[PDB]
Symmetry: D2
Subunit: 428 residues, 4 copies
């Protein structure tokens, strides 16, 4: 449960030791409730005033959700975590907790298409936040984009689907020198990469993906390392008395957990992007097998890459350590326990033959998701990144002929068998 225990021990125990005291239930109960009876009038007031911890209302906190949050925090070795309705909500909250109208964010370009559209369109239109996209393959572009309005630097661990890996430590040094935190979306690399150990201050997850692992539940997570000093004047909301809580100071009351505390008391309570206790239950079950699944995902993915490189129908193949990958060196440096499950390739004939490939699949699933146990395929340019212009797609690494694979944990020969027949048919 603590930092002394192994990763798999934590994934099975952290946040729920001892078990619930009334009945001793070994599994995390599904507290499908909105409300909780208070001990007395004074207890209720202390709870609402942030003077005592406890459960008040499922929008703000819930015992099932708390187990997931505390377990994620222990696995990331952070000071606390917060679960929200979706990955999008986690990214939105992570930004909104330290940024507002007029503020800026410096973001990498290897982004999931929904993150780009949020940064490029929705956050500007609705929150007045101005995101400056840069080529994070060169840390200098991060440095040169930072202004006095920048509030954070944002990166994806392995670009979806660019498959580029930024130089985390070099970029973190730059962000901290300018007094801003580094935010890392570790959606595609839980367990196999520890962002906090390489300069990241905040980590967000799409729990929907590898953390859940079974494609059953939408969810998002925010994890606070507690390592960042919020008192440099650039984040007064975390320092100054909060009028909505009659003067509470997050840095004073919550100390290293100031950031993740305000995500709950401010953003979750008012904006209301809360996770269902049922979804949290399913995410907890997913965590219990994460390390086993990631190892298989990455073992199979490497074999898929080798198969695609030698197939006559395949124009090109990309993977974080591919010979042609611009950031191959970073991947070798930072990814010591697998290079991810996402594999991209192009089929001879361009976009048109790719569609024949997708339409010929008999086992691989054509759908919008990643990090399911099943192997998945999709054409990002018309789907996950459809919202972006042709040039914006190129900036994220999406080409008109790109096929995106999420290599699952089937027996790899059956994955390869389905790929081969579909590729041969694609050349007809």
């Amino acid at each position: 449960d603590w930092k002394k225990y192994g990763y798999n021990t934590r994934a099975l125990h952290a946040g729920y030791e001892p078990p619930e005291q009334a009945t001793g239930s070994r599994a995390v109960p599904i507290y499908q409730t909105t409300s909780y009876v208070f001990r007395d009038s004074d207890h209720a007031a202390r709870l609402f005033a942030l003077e005592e911890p406890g459960f008040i209302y499922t929008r703000i906190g819930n015992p099932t959700v708390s187990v997931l949050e505390e377990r994620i925090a222990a696995l990331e070795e952070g000071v606390g975590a917060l679960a929200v309705a979706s990955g999008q909500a986690a990214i939105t909250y992570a930004i909104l907790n330290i940024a507002g109208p007029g503020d800026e964010i410096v973001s990498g370009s290897a982004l999931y298409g929904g993150t780009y559209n949020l940064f490029r369109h929705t956050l500007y239109k609705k929150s007045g936040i101005i995101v400056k996209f840069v080529d994070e393959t060169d840390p200098k572009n991060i440095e040169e984009a930072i202004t006095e309005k920048t509030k954070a630097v944002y990166l994806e661990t392995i670009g979806n689907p660019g498959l580029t890996v930024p130089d985390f430590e070099a970029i973190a040094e730059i962000a901290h020198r300018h007094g801003v935190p580094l935010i890392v979306d570790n959606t595609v690399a839980p367990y196999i990469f520890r962002p906090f150990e390489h300069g990241a201050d905040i980590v967000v997850y799409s729990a929907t993906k590898f953390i859940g692992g079974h494609g059953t539940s939408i969810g998002g997570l925010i994890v606070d390392s507690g390592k960042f000093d919020w008192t440099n004047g650039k984040f007064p909301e975390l320092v100054e008395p909060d009028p909505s809580y009659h003067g509470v100071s997050y840095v004073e009351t919550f100390k290293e957990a100031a950031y993740i505390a305000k995500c709950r008391t401010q953003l979750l309570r008012d904006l209301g992007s809360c996770m269902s206790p049922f979804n949290a239950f399913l995410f907890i079950l997913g965590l219990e097998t994460l390390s086993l699944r990631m190892k298989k995902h990455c073992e199979n993915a490497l074999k898929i890459v080798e198969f695609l490189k030698s197939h006559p129908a395949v124009s090109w193949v990309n993977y974080p350590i591919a010979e042609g990958n611009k950031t191959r060196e970073n991947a070798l440096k930072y990814l010591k326990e697998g290079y991810g499950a996402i594999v991209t390739f192009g089929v001879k004939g361009g976009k048109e033959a790719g569609k024949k490939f997708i339409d010929s699949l008999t086992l691989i699933s054509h759908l919008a998701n990643i990090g399911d146990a099943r192997t998945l395929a999709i054409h990002p340019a018309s789907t996950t990144h459809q919202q972006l212009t042709e040039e914006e797609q190129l900036k994220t690494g999406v080409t008109p002929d790109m096929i995106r694979l999420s290599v699952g944990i089937e027996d790899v020969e059956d994955i390869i068998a389905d790929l081969d027949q579909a590729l041969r048919k694609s050349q007809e």
Copy 2:
């Protein structure tokens, strides 16, 4: 399912006739999935490009949630509905869909404390929206607050816990004359009041409360009447080509459902406050008995009021048709099928004896919720409205001595008995 069928028939059938065609399941299945397999590449492209309706990803839409959405729409006689993670998210989305940084909102003052804090602080700090609180008990106050930056007028059906009822028709005329829609929070009066029949253009619900009815699940709903013309120049996002969808015009493509459509394609997709399919399943079950429960709720409330008015320990009692209610006339006009389940009262001895009353309850539950099947009690000044200053509390109708009851559907004799013993103990 259609407008020809009764309320209860619709509450049992609308949105799910015929049953799911693969197996014929009479109950609404729980589609606890993230993703859906596409027929082919062209099908996937048409879905993502908004050219054909269908299911893409549970963050954006889901078959279980769709049944809830369509059934609520049928019960409200709207053109469409959208389910979100919570009542707060529904309110946030309802505003953000037609308002942004610099824009203004005219809002009533009888607000749930979380709505007030959202309007007063969070929407300002995070979205730059300026909410103008007014005394909605006199329609003139609405008119005089509207400027050329106003995007909507916002009201609660029966103030939580002010118990004031605004003049819906009069305010709707004012909002429409200035070319802005009326948004009505009908959380506390589903079935028993139809805002669309009295000038409202958008309705939001905390489904958490009476719609669910059993205190199991957090949820929110947005209902679009389809009656409002968005083309007067004040809502360009609904008319002009959307850059994020390569030129789609919401009024052109979706006609009467433009508003609720952008709620989904923009706000739900990017901000990510999605509802769980499991929660929607439970809300659907609640709707099937809603009319029966509301009738019982309101019948018990009338008797509880009579009992409290005659008790020696009770300083005052409020209810929408109480003689002393400032908006008694509006309540008599608009509330023809029950005056709600919420009852407020003061105990001799002020705040101190009130706290003893709460602490002496043995059957009524001391918790934060309304619209549960069980009878509930709380002290709003220190709980639901703690975030507000003393003067803001008075503006919402919360007094330091106020006890709020949510009268449940127990046998009324047992409710009265628990009140009586606790009221007598409060005088010791």
Copy 3:
């Protein structure tokens, strides 16, 4: 929770007051767990030895399931209840708990088709129990069938679908004088009839039906009145030391609850017909509206009967108080709060026109169930009672032309409207 509180108060509170002590969750949590951590080695031993109550293993007992059991017991005013996988399982356990190879059961003939087949075939072939079916419309037939091997007398409250009602008190007098308990399947009449107030010793329910009320979940319940003396020598398994529990005597240890206690420690533990915690959660929600739904069911049923009596397409109509019903007097005597939701009728043209009626329904659902909120229809001779010979069907009240309705809680005008169009098509 106690006998002092009203039925609806109990339906909202009994078995879960106070709420679960660890978190105070107002809703009954879903303890989807198999196992429970024991305090110590000695605690575990005392639990397994039946020396102390507690939770051991979900096959045997579960906190969510316990609330349902304790709540059902409070509504029936019994000493205890047991939840099982299905109504069939409840009936199977009720019999096997006091009968074995060579023993006899005296049963009425107005039986659900699955109960008849269990009694006539499966319990004989698999347990050696010999069921003696009699015409329970005359209590004398019960008396004359009892032998020294008889272990119980079994009845349905309102025959499904014979719609006959036995003389409960007269039959109870007969059974008790012969030293055997009366078992009553109250599936179709919860709340509206209390068998314990009219001589019944044990009650079973298909929780699937009206108790759930929404057609989501299969479940069964066994309720023990505690009124029957098991020491007359005809039930030594309930008196003698149990070798499997090292000498425990159920009457000595469990006193009035000896019968329901062995159902759990013996039949549930070894035969394993356990209910899921999730299902119990849903039945608990159903109980909270049971009285409201049953009243509506019965109000609508009376109106449907009158409509069918006047329709030109209808050959005949039956209801417990119909002029031609053999047990109209029993129905008038015992059913003081509604006569049930089941209605049977025949259409001119016999069996062939009946099929045309069923196939012409557009709102009433053609499926196998009763006591759903929706109105249902089926042809028992080919479905629920298909397993029975022609003569056995007649003994249960099923005729070749019989259509069975389960009148739901839609607005009655929509039910009648759908009936009318479908009956007219049946005559074409």
Copy 4:
């Protein structure tokens, strides 16, 4: 999905390819319904008469449960499977399908205590079946116990907790030569052992254990290999016309699936030990990681065995391949992919020091279960096998000082640490 695909591919796809056709949901929906709308009167009649397959009623079959059933059958390469409420119910149904009053079963003695109690007491008292327990470590004991009343031979793969492994092939030869099937309880060895490849005809599982893998859900499975000829005269119920289905012959109508078909149409339909769709949903998720979890379970168990053998506090250690194990040879021959997760040992000081060991655990959970992801410990003599006499306990391999471990998938260092500290305290 078919026999050509690997085990893990089948574990991810079999039974749900293609996805449900109405919405294409990639995850298996939770069909939490009781009933299904029929196409027409003739369709309903054909279903109930067993003339066409389809869904009728969740007690008998359900689309979510069917996916679990078909996936288990595909993993076992059997002709079909049936899901029931519990492992106990699976064992009960497997026996009752081919046995009745007066019949005999030849069973091994290395049994779970609940199976022993079912065989020794409940099946005798309630079904008149006479189980003859033998020492299955010598196949001759099976041969010499068979009479003309024998209907099956029953074995556990790895005795719980005897840890003995029978000679499956030798016993299967004896059973088949005498014209009776071999039934194998493979609860503790899914994936790692394939009973059908070694003479077994029927396999039963407690899905509760490793198949679920997370201690969330009670469930049982019956798997039919389809290999056994039921027409040798010893099983007339599977050949002769069935009176309850108006002459249907299971061998004639269902061919290789005769046995598993009658389990459903007779035993499940009438005795009613049905599984919840929600539980089945969770079992499907568990299967997706089964091969991963089983490998880790067995790797850790081998290391735990090594650690216990060298600890000064440990009197003895048992494991399927332990030097002192009577069936070490059988274990080496049949178990080529892991020797299970269950490990037993005794502590110096006998029963008294063992209790101190159990009471000193801080990470390993003291509860009644096996095959959870967490490491578990219990004292079988006072818990799982308490119902057995001292002599019966020894015959199953349970000694007064035996501690049973279910080694989970934590990091093995943390498991050893908790064992070590607890063993040291046991010597004080």
